[PDB]
């Protein structure tokens, strides 16, 4: 009954079957011959079952150790996350003190979700790409076909939606904005 927690073990069935055959043989008044034969079979089935039970405990122990290792790895990650947070706080506190307009501009823009996709270039007419999460942020930097960003002006070369389908600069008004699939990915060249 309690040994039925190993009911899943394959050697369990054989063991249970051997016990039953014996019990039934005794109940039927079978001879010593058969009785010892069935009992021999039962003892062996029992020993094999016991060895399986040990393997099961071992598979469980190992799983448990794996879970424990995961917990430590998780606690470790959390610690790393705190370190990362500390470094970024330190990094932005320093950027703030540097008080450079261009850097501040991309940071403030990033604050509103306006971030670059490729590395900001310094080449004349170089290729820049940025994602604009909503019409609010879009209007703060887009004035016609000219994009203002990083203390510089760019010329929109193309505007694409969230499905990758092109989008005209005309179909981007306060009123139509709801009909577009955001965010929008703007491509532009340095002036």
């Amino acid at each position: 009954a309690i040994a039925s927690e190993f009911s899943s073990l394959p050697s369990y069935a054989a063991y249970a079957t051997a016990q039953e055959a014996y019990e039934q043989a005794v109940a039927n008044g079978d001879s010593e011959v058969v009785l010892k034969k069935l009992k021999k079979s039962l003892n062996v089935a029992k020993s094999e079952f016991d060895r399986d039970a040990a393997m099961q405990r071992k598979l469980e122990k190992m799983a448990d150790q794996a879970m424990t290792q995961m917990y430590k790895q998780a606690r470790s990650e959390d610690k790393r996350a705190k370190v990362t947070s500390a470094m970024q706080t330190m990094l932005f506190t320093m950027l703030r003190k540097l008080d450079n307009d261009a850097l501040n501009n991309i940071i403030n823009n990033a604050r509103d979700g306006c971030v670059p996709l490729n590395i900001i270039p310094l080449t004349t007419a170089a290729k820049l790409m940025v994602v604009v999460p909503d019409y609010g942020t879009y209007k703060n930097t887009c004035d016609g076909n000219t994009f203002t960003y990083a203390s510089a002006l760019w010329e929109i070369q193309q505007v694409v939606d969230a499905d990758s389908k092109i989008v005209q600069l005309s179909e981007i008004n306060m009123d139509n904005s709801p009909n577009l699939a955001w965010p929008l990915i703007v491509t532009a060249l340095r002036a």
Partner: protein, 74 residues
């Protein structure tokens, strides 16, 4: 200089942060970050340093998932 030394130090912390975010797992990009960082450290012109800083910082900013700024500027 003073303005020059503060920008150089900042680039060191910035590159570290990029490493912390496991950017080194992308050889291509990591190579560019290092070159950018090295040029900033070897700059004598304060304008050359900041122009590069803008490019280096943008790598960090592009990683939206790991750079929620308005939460750090708070």
């Amino acid at each position: 200089s003073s303005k020059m030394s503060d920008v150089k130090c900042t680039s060191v912390v910035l590159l570290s942060v990029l490493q912390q975010l496991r950017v080194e797992s992308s050889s291509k990009l990591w190579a560019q970050c290092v070159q950018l960082h090295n040029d900033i450290l070897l700059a004598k012109d304060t304008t050359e340093a900041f122009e590069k800083m803008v490019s280096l910082l943008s790598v960090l900013l592009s990683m939206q998932g790991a750079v929620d700024i308005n939460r750090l500027c708070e």
